[PDB]
Structures are given as structure tokens and as C-alpha cells.
Amino acid sequence: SMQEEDTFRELRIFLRNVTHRLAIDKRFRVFTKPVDPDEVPDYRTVIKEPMDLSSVISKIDLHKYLTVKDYLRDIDLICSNALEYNPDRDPGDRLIRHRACALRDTAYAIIKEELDEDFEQLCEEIQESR
Ligand SMILES: O=C(c1ccco1)N1CCN(C(=O)C2CC2)CC1
Ligand SMILES: O=C(c1ccco1)N1CCN(C(=O)C2CC2)CC1
């Protein structure tokens, strides 16, 4: 229905706003673009499904997310990739992991405060019906 297409349009507006607020935070600059294969040629041998905030924007506009649960799976993948590739005790790995955990926690906190639970439940029930 037109009413259901309006629901998914409102979801996309919400997701673009959250993603922009993450992408302008100086702590999260390292997560804004894909890892450069020329600088880190080993990255794509270890990390099987790369993800970053520019790719998340592209996926919103492709209509890949029908629920906020769909979106948070990709935020969780950005974080888990960083914890997997950078697991060591040295300061450079520890700084990346602290920033990855802060990206995940900040996304969840914005969504807890600003996403209505009944709006998310409506999105889930339309998705289930298709
Ligand atoms: O090895 C490097 C690197 C980049 C330039 C020179 O070395 N990196 C940084 C980028 N990496 C990430 O995991 C970023 C968190 C997304 C992988 C580690
Ligand atoms: O579906 C929702 C939601 C957000 C706002 C209204 O409904 N979310 C957030 C809360 N979630 C968590 O896993 C919490 C970290 C434990 C699951 C996805």
C-alpha cells in the first residue's frame, strides 16, 4: 500500500540522519570509507564481508533496510570486523577497538532514545507479510 511505502520512506530518513551523526564524529573517521586495498592488501583475505558508513548510506538509498534490526546488523559488522582484524595489545589496535565499541554503543543509544518501538514493530510486520 501507499501507507506502507510512506512507512519505509520515514525509516530511510531516520537511518540517514543517524548515519550522518556517526560519520561527522572525529572518533569514527576510520569507519567512514572502505579499507584501501592498496594500503592494506591482506585486509580482504581475513575480513570476508567488509562494511563502512559510506556503504551503509548507499544501502539505505538502494532500499536494502526494511527494519532498524537490518541496519544494526551492518553497524555490528563494522564493529566485529575491527575487533577481528585488530586484536593485539599494542596501542594502535587498542585505539581502533575502543573506537569500534564506541561506534556500536553510540548507534544503539541514539536508537533507544529516538526510535519509537511501535514504529519498529510496524516495519517488522510489513517485512514479514512480503
Ligand atoms: O593496517 C592498517 C593501516 C592503514 C594504513 C596503514 O596501515 N589498518 C588501518 C585500517 N584498518 C581497520 O580495520 C580500520 C578500522 C577500520 C585495518 C588496519
Ligand atoms: O528493535 C530495536 C528498537 C530500537 C528502538 C525500538 O525498537 N532495536 C534496539 C534494541 N536491540 C538490542 O539488541 C539491544 C542492545 C541490546 C534490538 C534492536
Side-chain angles (χ1 to χ4, degrees), residues 1-25 27-130:
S1 68
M2 167 93 286
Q3 303 100 287
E4 292 169 342
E5 294 312 315
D6 286 353
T7 302
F8 295 132
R9 205 168 307 104
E10 175 163 356
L11 173 68
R12 294 189 298 268
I13 293 162
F14 173 75
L15 296 180
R16 295 191 194 83
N17 177 267
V18 174
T19 307
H20 177 253
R21 287 154 63 188
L22 299 173
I24 68 173
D25 189 308
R27 295 173 294 169
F28 307 147
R29 187 179 183 287
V30 69
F31 306 118
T32 60
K33 302 187 308 189
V35 172
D36 188 341
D38 293 325
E39 294 189 0
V40 198
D42 166 83
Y43 188 78
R44 287 164 177 83
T45 72
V46 175
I47 298 303
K48 300 305 178 180
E49 194 173 2
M51 190 52 59
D52 68 276
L53 297 171
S54 73
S55 301
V56 168
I57 286 297
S58 292
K59 288 186 67 173
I60 295 166
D61 291 343
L62 287 165
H63 301 195
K64 298 275 184 174
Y65 309 120
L66 301 182
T67 74
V68 183
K69 280 190 173 72
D70 286 351
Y71 170 86
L72 287 169
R73 285 190 230 301
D74 277 343
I75 302 300
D76 282 317
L77 181 59
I78 296 172
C79 179
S80 67
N81 288 344
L83 305 185
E84 180 177 359
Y85 192 81
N86 312 281
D88 296 349
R89 72 86 47 210
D90 62 84
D93 284 22
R94 285 185 173 167
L95 177 61
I96 286 168
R97 295 204 305 278
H98 192 267
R99 291 167 165 181
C101 291
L103 173 74
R104 173 201 67 204
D105 291 348
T106 299
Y108 276 83
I110 292 168
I111 286 160
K112 182 180 179 182
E113 279 214 325
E114 299 178 30
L115 168 68
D116 187 302
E117 292 180 35
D118 294 335
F119 181 87
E120 174 63 12
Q121 186 66 35
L122 176 60
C123 290
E124 293 179 17
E125 291 181 3
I126 303 164
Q127 178 189 56
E128 280 155 7
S129 75
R130 303 219 158 164

